[PDB]
Design a protein around this ligand. Structure first.
Ligand SMILES: NC(=O)C1=CN([C@@H]2O[C@H](COP(=O)(O)OP(=O)(O)OC[C@H]3O[C@@H](n4cnc5c(N)ncnc54)[C@H](OP(=O)(O)O)[C@@H]3O)[C@@H](O)[C@H]2O)C=CC1
Length: 318
């Protein structure tokens, strides 16, 4: 179950996300990755800022070493963080991730956010008022650095995350552009269906990879705890009953039928296994329209601490 990227490489349409809630120890990522591999997942999504690439890498290497899977059958994604967007720092960050993973290459490397922060070891540099210290970077130069990483064989494909249409255009219209982003990883679910951005990405052969498909893990410090819980949506419950599935399976299938590559995370083995059942049924065209009607511009992860940044991506309509 894969789709072909604009650079010729293949990506599994269902991926397991390795980000964790604030209360979980980093080692949890190793445990879950092993469970996900046993459940049939081949696509794993990580990021340098998660600081658990070492744990995910150990899980994958353990399953390769014991005969469960081969490296070529695993699709691993990492992302360069805001503090390393400067052109001269991009490759250094990827090389650091490769060392943590003890991998020769990653399958996909993304710009995590189109917003640079003061360079340094600290991922969230702040001033004396507790405000993030923004930095200005030539994102087209950042992209050129990403292209060099691909040409150096450190990553098979390159893309972006949390970019809006104008930011994608900046790259697409860049003079000397060699590789278009293969994807734009953004938040997407029935309450924020990204109809406009999805249409734009499709017209440019850019795959939309979705997170928050099940409403996000509601991370403390990022998600408003008073926001509605997506899977509690009555329409998803009614549809789950109709198709004899679960609200989560309905939400996952909705996105797959829109041509979206979906990420998902669960701390429970039973659910990790259940989610693989999304390939077993089809939502009718009429029911897809019912789910299209739930849009309400509910953005669970607005990256609020970045508000004020000249490149905050969520101000524009899309
Ligand atoms: N690029 C970016 O900016 C970001 C990327 N991500 C990526 O997206 C991945 C997915 O995470 P996220 O979007 O937060 O979360 P999801 O929307 O994928 O999941 C939200 C919740 O769904 C629950 N859930 C999962 N499966 C089931 C099921 N079968 N039945 C009932 N409940 C279920 C989980 O709860 P429980 O664990 O209790 O089962 C989980 O807390 C991350 O790990 C990361 O890789 C995340 C945030 C930002």
């Amino acid at each position: 179950h894969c789709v072909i990227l604009n650079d010729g490489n293949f990506i599994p349409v269902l991926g397991f996300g390795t980000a964790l809630p604030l209360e979980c120890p980093k080692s949890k990522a190793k445990e879950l990755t092993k469970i996900a591999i046993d459940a049939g997942f081949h696509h794993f999504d990580s990021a340098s800022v998660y600081n658990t690439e070492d744990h995910v890498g150990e899980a994958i290497r353990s399953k390769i070493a014991d005969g469960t899977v081969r490296r070529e059958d695993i699709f691993y994604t990492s992302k360069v963080w805001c503090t390393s967007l400067h052109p001269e720092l991009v490759r250094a960050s990827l090389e650091r991730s490769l060392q943590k993973l003890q991998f020769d290459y990653v399958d996909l490397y993304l710009i995590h956010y189109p917003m640079a922060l003061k360079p340094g070891e600290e991922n969230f540099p702040v001033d004396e008022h507790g405000k993030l210290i923004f930095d200005r970077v030539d994102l087209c130069a950042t992209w050129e650095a990403m292209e060099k990483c691909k040409d150096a064989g450190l990553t098979k494909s390159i893309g972006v995350s949390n970019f809006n249409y104008r930011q994608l255009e900046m790259i697409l219209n860049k003079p000397g552009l060699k590789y278009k982003p293969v994807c734009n990883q953004v938040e997407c679910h029935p309450y924020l269906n990204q109809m406009k951005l999805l249409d734009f990405c499709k017209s440019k052969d850019i795959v939309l990879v979705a997170y928050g498909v099940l409403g996000t893990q509601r991370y403390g410090g990022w998600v408003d705890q008073n926001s509605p819980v997506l899977l509690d949506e009555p329409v998803l419950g009614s549809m789950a009953k109709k198709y004899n599935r679960t609200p989560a399976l309905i939400a996952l299938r909705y996105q797959l039928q829109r041509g979206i590559v979906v990420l998902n995370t669960s701390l429970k083995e039973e659910r990790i296994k259940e989610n693989m059942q999304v390939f077993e049924f089809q939502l009718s065209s009429e029911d897809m329209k019912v789910l299209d009607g739930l849009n309400r511009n509910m953005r669970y992860i607005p990256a609020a601490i970045f508000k004020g940044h000249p490149n905050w991506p969520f101000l524009d309509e899309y």
